[PDB]
Paper text:
In this study, we structurally characterize the interaction of the broadest and most potent MPER-targeting antibody, 10E8, with viral membrane lipids and scaffolded MPER and propose how 10E8 approaches the MPER-viral membrane epitope during neutralization. The membrane proximal external region (MPER) of Env is one of its most conserved regions and, hence, the focus of vaccine and therapeutic design efforts. To aid in characterization of the complete 10E8 epitope consisting of MPER and lipids, we designed an epitope-scaffold that presented the MPER on a stable framework in the 10E8-bound conformation derived from previous crystal structures. T117v2 is a variant of the previously reported T117 epitope-scaffold that presents the 10E8 core helical epitope residues and binds to mature 10E8 with 29 pM affinity.
In addition, mutants 4 and 5 were designed to disrupt the lipid-binding site that we observe in the crystal structures. X-ray structures of mutants 1–3 and 5 were determined in complex with the T117v2 scaffold at 1.6 Å (mutant 1) and 2.0–2.2 Å (mutants 2, 3 and 5) resolution. Only in mutant 5 do the R29A(L) and Y32A(L) mutations produce a slight shift in the main-chain for FRL2 (residues 48, 49), CDRL2 (50–56), FRL3 (57–72) and CDRL1 (24–32) with maximum Cα differences observed in CDRL2 (1.3 Å for Lys51(L)), FRL3 (0.9 Å for Gly68(L)) and CDRL1 (0.9 Å between Arg29(L) and Ala29(L); S4 Fig). The shift for CDRL2 in mutant 5 may be the direct result of substituting Tyr32(L) with alanine, which allows the nearby Phe48(L) side chain to rotate and influence the conformation of Lys51(L), Asn52(L) and Asn53(L). In mutant 5, where R29(L) and Y32 (L) are mutated to alanine, glycerol (used for cryoprotection) is not observed at this location in either of the two Fabs in the asymmetric unit, suggesting that the lipid binding site is severely disrupted by these mutations. Mutations R29E(L) and Y32E(L) in mutant 4 (1.2 nM KD for T117v2) resulted in a ~ 40 fold reduction in binding compared to the affinity-matured 10E8 IgG (0.029 nM for T117v2), while mutation of the same residues to alanine in mutant 5 (~0.12 nM KD) resulted in only a 4-fold decrease in binding. Interestingly, mutation of only R29(L) and Y32(L) to alanine in mutant 5, which was designed to disrupt the observed lipid-binding site, also abrogated the neutralization of most of the viruses tested (breadth of 44%), despite retaining picomolar binding affinity to the epitope scaffolds. Substantial loss of neutralization occurred when the lipid-binding site was disrupted (mutant 5) or when the light-chain surface patch contained mainly acidic residues (mutant 3). In contrast, mutants 2, 3 and 5 each eluted as a single peak with a molecular weight of approximately 150 kDa.
Residue numbers in the entry:
A (entry chain L): 1, 3 to 9, 11 to 95, 95A, 95B, 95C, 96 to 211
B (entry chain E): 11 to 59, 61 to 163
C (entry chain H): 1 to 52, 52A, 52B, 52C, 53 to 82, 82A, 82B, 82C, ...
């Protein structure tokens, strides 16, 4: 990426947070900044030297020096939880534009909530075919960020893993699901399988074994 | 392309105001078909809502308006006999005493930015600026033409 | 008061072509520059290309992964922006946004050609490039009871319980096969509908 942004930043309610955009083209060209929420059109937050579109809150401000552009959010509000993107030229003097990779801003909006992990073994209706699936369901965690690691016996498994990104529920908490694909041979030829869900340092593990 | 003709350079007398300068510099552009017929009025109101550049030793203004009012790229230059006040482009209280006026009638954004960049270099060339205040219209036309030529 | 209504997004095959449209309103379109931007699922915004105005001869610039395959055009009489996409690839999939595009250049600090910024955005139209054939799901029970809706194409599927509480249907996963799967778990002390394949299934969880 021509323009480098931090991947993710957190800020408590009412605190100030600065996120940055870095690239050689910023020494010659100003950056503009965009906010984007899930499912919604991006919005322009400001551009140029000291320009802020009408309707954009005063608390969004930007600065720049050298190869660096910065977006500063004063007293962060709950609705500022979003993705933030910078844009500029891809190189000095270019007619093209480019976006940074985006920064996920988490505004700590509620107390931390450990996730619920249910793990279903492959069903015998599925085994009677020629396939087997483990379904790891993760429910009601905050903030929305979890890591899933599968274990066969005590050894890790990376092949056949498919995991969804976290989704917001109807109670302002998050959920995720992970799937492991196995041929029915390697299902029954192991003692057990585990789904290790890591959330904010703490870990919750569930385990299944080919014995109903 | 940028049209710059010999009659697009002129000296202006000591009794002209901001609005007379704009109209005088716009009339050759109007008469050759480079800008809309009311181009001058749109420069005046855009300037009031400012293009004065405080530079030593000669103050400069760059009046212009929205590209939508330009039919063909052109530039019109005015050399003032006596300094005339333009409001600072940056937004400083003191008015800029101006003696050189670059009227920009550019409709192409890439030319606008190239020309503004060239102007920025030119007005920091003190020998060039001093020359502008003493050369005749043809010499100014030839000097700037050569510089616009080198730009493109 | 600005609206930018994109359309034309849908399922298309790799190597196929697709045309997107954007109807603009609420601003002077004839003099506006216009940009297309895309967001691949799960990724960031990616600038696609931009068409200039009359003073620039409607010239167009394109991003590197797209140049030579995509064409941006416009018809000012009806305030439409177009994106013509040829030889589509899997990685062209995602949400495509049109954006009204402003131009910025600071005299004392600027460098040609200044900077473009994106002052109004549409909601986007979704493009999915896939080789996958329409396939009804296989429904398997999860004896908190669940239901596994595996290997269907394309989206969506709808899952309800006892033909109509406390049910959590999870979003679909997109597998390397090009097919989707999802799960619906309900906690106690299923009705899966795939309209693209006319498949209905009532799997009882014994």
């Amino acid at each position: 990426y021509e323009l480098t942004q931090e991947t993710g930043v957190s800020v408590a309610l009412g605190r100030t947070v600065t996120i940055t955009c870095r690239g050689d083209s910023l020494a010659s060209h100003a950056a503009s900044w965009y906010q984007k929420k899930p499912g919604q059109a991006p919005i322009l937050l400001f551009y140029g030297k000291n320009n802020r579109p009408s309707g954009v809150p005063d608390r969004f401000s930007g600065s720049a020096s050298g190869n660096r552009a910065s977006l500063t959010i004063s007293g962060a509000q709950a609705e500022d939880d979003a993705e933030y993107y910078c844009s500029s030229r891809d190189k000095s003097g270019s007619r093209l534009s480019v976006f940074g990779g985006g920064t996920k801003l988490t505004v700590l909006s509620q107390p931390k909530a450990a996730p619920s992990v249910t793990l279903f073994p492959p069903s015998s209706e599925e085994l009677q075919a020629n396939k087997a699936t483990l379904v790891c369901l993760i429910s009601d965690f905050y903030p929305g960020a979890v890591t899933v690691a599968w274990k066969a016996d005590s050894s890790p498994v990376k092949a056949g893993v498919e995991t969804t990104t976290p989704s917001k529920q109807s109670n302002n908490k998050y959920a995720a699901s992970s799937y492991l694909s196995l041929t029915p041979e390697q299902w029954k030829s192991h003692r057990s399988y585990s789904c290790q869900v890591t959330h904010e340092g703490s870990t919750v593990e569930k385990t299944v074994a080919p014995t109903e | 392309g940028i049209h710059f003709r010999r009659h697009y350079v002129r000296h202006l007398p000591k009794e002209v105001s901001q609005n007379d300068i704009i109209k005088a510099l716009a009339s050759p552009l109007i008469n050759d078909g480079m800008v809309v017929s009311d181009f001058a009025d749109h420069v005046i109101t855009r300037e009031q809502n400012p293009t004065g550049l405080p530079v030593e030793p000669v103050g400069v203004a760059i009046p212009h308006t929205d590209s939508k009012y330009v039919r063909q790229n052109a530039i019109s230059v005015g050399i003032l006999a006596e300094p005339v006040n333009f409001e600072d482009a940056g937004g400083e209280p003191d008015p800029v005493p101006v003696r050189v006026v670059f009227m920009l009638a550019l409709g192409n954004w890439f030319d606008i930015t190239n020309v503004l960049w060239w102007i920025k270099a030119v007005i920091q060339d003190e020998d060039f600026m001093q020359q502008l205040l003493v050369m005749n219209d043809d010499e100014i036309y030839q000097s700037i033409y050569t510089r616009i030529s080198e730009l493109e | 008061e600005v609206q930018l209504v994109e359309s034309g997004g849908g399922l298309v095959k790799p190597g196929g072509s697709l045309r997107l449209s954007c109807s603009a309103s609420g601003f002077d379109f004839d003099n506006a520059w216009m940009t297309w931007v895309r967001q691949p699922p799960g990724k960031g915004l990616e600038w696609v290309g931009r068409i200039t105005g009359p003073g620039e001869g409607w010239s167009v610039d394109y991003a590197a992964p797209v140049e030579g395959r995509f064409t941006i055009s416009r018809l000012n009489s009806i305030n439409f922006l177009y994106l013509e996409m040829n030889n589509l690839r899997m990685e062209d999939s995602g949400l495509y946004f049109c954006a009204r595009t402003g131009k910025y250049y600071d005299f004392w600090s600027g460098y040609p050609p200044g900077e473009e910024y994106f002052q109004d955005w549409g909601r986007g139209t979704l493009v999915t490039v896939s080789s996958a054939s329409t396939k009804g799901p296989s429904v398997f029970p999860l004896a908190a009871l669940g239901c596994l809706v595996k290997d269907y194409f394309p989206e969506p599927v709808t899952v309800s319980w006892n033909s109509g509480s406390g049910v959590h249907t999870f979003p679909a996963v997109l597998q390397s096969s090009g097919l989707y799967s999802l799960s619906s778990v309900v906690t106690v002390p299923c009705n899966v509908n795939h309209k693209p394949s006319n498949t209905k299934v009532d799997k009882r969880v014994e």
